[PDB]
Amino acid sequence: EFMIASVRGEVLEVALDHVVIEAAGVGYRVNATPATLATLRQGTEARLITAMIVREDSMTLYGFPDGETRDLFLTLLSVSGVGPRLAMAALAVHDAPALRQVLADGNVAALTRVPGIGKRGAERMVLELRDKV
Amino acid sequence: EFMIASVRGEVLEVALDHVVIEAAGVGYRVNATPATLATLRQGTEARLITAMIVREDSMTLYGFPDGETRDLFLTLLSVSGVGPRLAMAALAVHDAPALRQVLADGNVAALTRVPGIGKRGAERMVLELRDKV
Amino acid sequence: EFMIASVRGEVLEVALDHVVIEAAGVGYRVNATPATLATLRQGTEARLITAMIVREDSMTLYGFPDGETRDLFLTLLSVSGVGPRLAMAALAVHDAPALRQVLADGNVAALTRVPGIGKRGAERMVLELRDKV
Amino acid sequence: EFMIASVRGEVLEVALDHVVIEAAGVGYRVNATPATLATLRQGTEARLITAMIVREDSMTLYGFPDGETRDLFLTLLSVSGVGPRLAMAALAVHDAPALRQVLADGNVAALTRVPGIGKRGAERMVLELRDKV
Amino acid sequence: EFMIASVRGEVLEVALDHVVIEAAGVGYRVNATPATLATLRQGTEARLITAMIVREDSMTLYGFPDGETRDLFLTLLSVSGVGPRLAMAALAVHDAPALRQVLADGNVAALTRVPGIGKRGAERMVLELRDKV
Amino acid sequence: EFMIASVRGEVLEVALDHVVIEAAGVGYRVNATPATLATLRQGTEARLITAMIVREDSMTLYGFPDGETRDLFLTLLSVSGVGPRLAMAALAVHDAPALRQVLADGNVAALTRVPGIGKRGAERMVLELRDKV
Amino acid sequence: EFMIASVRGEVLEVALDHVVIEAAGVGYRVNATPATLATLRQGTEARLITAMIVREDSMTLYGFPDGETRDLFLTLLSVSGVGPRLAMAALAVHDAPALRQVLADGNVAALTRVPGIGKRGAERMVLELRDKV
Amino acid sequence: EFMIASVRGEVLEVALDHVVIEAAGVGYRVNATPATLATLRQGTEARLITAMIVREDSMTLYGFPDGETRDLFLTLLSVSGVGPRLAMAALAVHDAPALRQVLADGNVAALTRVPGIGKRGAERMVLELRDKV
């Protein structure tokens, strides 16, 4: 239940945590992993499969090269103590496929190499997510 | 008081609870009954009459082939204990016309064949809705 | 501080409390006084100067033929006990110019001819609004 | 985490606290410093790098000629007791570059020439922002 | 999960929707059905089995001569569209035993004699409560 | 629907906006008009008929020598734009009887002598309250 | 940060999920494990070390024979997905000492014998709590 | 506007961040600086001038040997970024008189010796509080 799932248009600017994609006059700001960003050139058209996240005081967009990745993102968020910034850092470090498998396997060690994930965090994931991927 | 009542564009993807309709660069994600979905081919343009639903932490879009159906949807929601998922399941099982008449007639038996509706639920509807359809 | 102030496109449907204006694939639903509605034909392009109203559980759009009217609408809302439905009924009965002057003059009698406005209501307006128009 | 970062289209109206920029049928209302406004002619296309601000009961857009300015705006807001109206008045009086440097230098005197900023206010800024610009 | 279930002390005042019971220096204000009230004399000690009701902007106490009645009260409240004032009016008209049985029997007619209960209301109760009493 | 309507005990301290009344070990802090305060000596027992006011982030108690006054207080609060501090200042200046009659009579002039009440304020009262006293 | 940590007085009633303890005229309702309850006779004085739990729409009290137990209760609650009812059921089945040690040892099997705790639940505890007991 | 300003009774337990003071059967839990605590013996009667702090999900009590101290506490809280825990740590380190004067003098150095107060924090205080003490 996200509403905006892809945004396509001319890339106006590429910073290092985000990008602005002009879709019909409206410049949309989506954030993505540096990896995603890299493959993006200003001036050229581009399409991200996005997760949209709404709270009482914000609406942020999150971008990815495919929804199989975006979808995984939404999942990470389903863990108690997983914020967007975080999920984004997790993906910056474990590509979608790379991640899914760590989580099936219960590879704590792997996850632990992520900024902000102690033993306890890593394991809450594997526990709540092992079946789920 | 819904704001977005129809969304028209190229169908980017058709999953089984939803579809993404690109409307001018912006890929919109609407959900609909499998029935609605069926009649939808990727690649081709398409238009859904939508119910838009806003809460503190989400904005979901709900799609239908016509507003006479969409409108009925909004109504189902008007019942205490009727969530979107639910209304959607009710329609998955009773087409708009099929439903309206069950509800006028007070056909509990009929409604009961819906996933998630006991005697008590079915009757809250018929009671609050019998006049209303 | 409203965000969306006008919506222009092909009129998809004209009901009696509202209209849907397709603006680039997206069908927007604005509400307006029957008067406004009247001047509107389906099939044809059209532009309303809109008031957009956001709460925790809704976003409604309100349409008018000009912002001098729309702006007055926003004002009505500034009165304690004036809801959108109401402001809309007030305008359905007193055109923008017609209204502004009633309110400057303190013409309670006039306002009283509005559905839902007792002595007390009418006067809260004139009191809080007399200077303001 | 702002969502809408630029809006491009035909300028429908230029008032003195804001402007409406039609982006694909949808008239967007952004506010900006008179300075920004000045450089804007009705009838002509135009692009503002915007800050979008969402609360429980509103969504306002704020416009600037560049994001280096817009970005500074977002920052001002990061101070306890700095509202949008305010940040806008601060920029109306100190251009982006002009401001950044006042804040690095700790030039209270300068800031004090802003409507609504006593000693105490000015200093909360310099204190929380001196490093930040 | 109510917290305060009885309040015992000298009756300071008996009005017609409520009473103040001083419990150790603190004058507590509980509301009750006129019936309950009747049996109460100022000056004398007294004990009510109370329902305590907390919201974001209030804490009201509701009093009864016994918890078998108080408990029923809490139940009435469990119905969608049953406010405290209401439950209190229902009891003012149907004593606890009298009521329980109407609700088991499904005696709409009976309930209908209550101020504020149409067909539809009465039936929501019987439906959600028939098993429950 | 206030909960605590009187508090009786030894006066621990008398400041100029409030007093602490120890009721069984618990020191309660009620606020009152200087007038009320005056008649109060530390060391001695005392009883105030109180209005209790609960919000998401506070619970304040308001004290008076009688509930006919306290009750009027609650009423003042019933006006859009009347805060507790205010109602308290209004009573500091117009005793209960003095006030009730100003409000019946529509004596704006009188009310206007209150700190914080312009023409417009005074009249909102008289309008919403004239019948009510 | 609980406020009310013990309540002492005459036991007015002992039901099977709770008890009412009159403390100075005010009948307090605390809930406890059947075990705690057992040791309690109506008519006699009694003291529970309580956890007090406040939300926007309720204030519940939870009772125990000692705070070493009560304190553990508060802890259980510190787990994502642990509600009061739950913590209470956990203690109904594992006395305080019995529990602490299961949690240090990581004895999932043990915890699993609790109503409402699957593998995943049990382990979230042991993970977040193993160090903590 | 605090409600509970003192609590007097037999000290049931003295831990190192708090104490429980039984006031008429009800054991109240107040927190205080170790200093305050020290002077407190279990078994004996005792009185703290308290600050009471209410939020949507808690009510905490804060205790001191006098209100001149308690009052200062409330003030600390008036600073953006000053939480209760904090104010308590500040007082644990600077007695009331000691503190007031640091803040008048603008003695950042002094404040800096407090756990959790960088340059920036210390100065927000002195700035917002210098006049205020």
UniProtKB/Swiss-Prot annotation, chains A, B, C, D, E, F, G, H:
Residues 66-133 are annotated as: Domain II. Its main location: cytoplasm. GO terms for biological process: DNA recombination; DNA repair. The keyword Transport does not apply. It is found in: Cytoplasm. Residues 3-65 are annotated as: Domain I. Keywords: Cytoplasm, DNA damage, DNA recombination, DNA repair, DNA-binding. The keyword Phosphoprotein does not apply. GO terms for cellular component: cytoplasm; Holliday junction helicase complex; Holliday junction resolvase complex. One of its GO terms (molecular function) is ATP binding. The RuvA-RuvB-RuvC complex processes Holliday junction (HJ) DNA during genetic recombination and DNA repair, while the RuvA-RuvB complex plays an important role in the rescue of blocked DNA replication forks via replication fork reversal (RFR). RuvA specifically binds to HJ cruciform DNA, conferring on it an open structure. The RuvB hexamer acts as an ATP-dependent pump, pulling dsDNA into and through the RuvAB complex. HJ branch migration allows RuvC to scan DNA until it finds its consensus sequence, where it cleaves and resolves the cruciform DNA. Has three domains with a flexible linker between the domains II and III and assumes an 'L' shape. Domain III is highly mobile and contacts RuvB. Belongs to the RuvA family. Homotetramer. Forms an RuvA(8)-RuvB(12)-Holliday junction (HJ) complex. HJ DNA is sandwiched between 2 RuvA tetramers; dsDNA enters through RuvA and exits via RuvB. An RuvB hexamer assembles on each DNA strand where it exits the tetramer. Each RuvB hexamer is contacted by two RuvA subunits (via domain III) on 2 adjacent RuvB subunits; this complex drives branch migration. In the full resolvosome a probable DNA-RuvA(4)-RuvB(12)-RuvC(2) complex forms which resolves the HJ. This is Holliday junction branch migration complex subunit RuvA. The gene is ruvA. The chain holds residues 1 to 131 of 196 of the full protein.
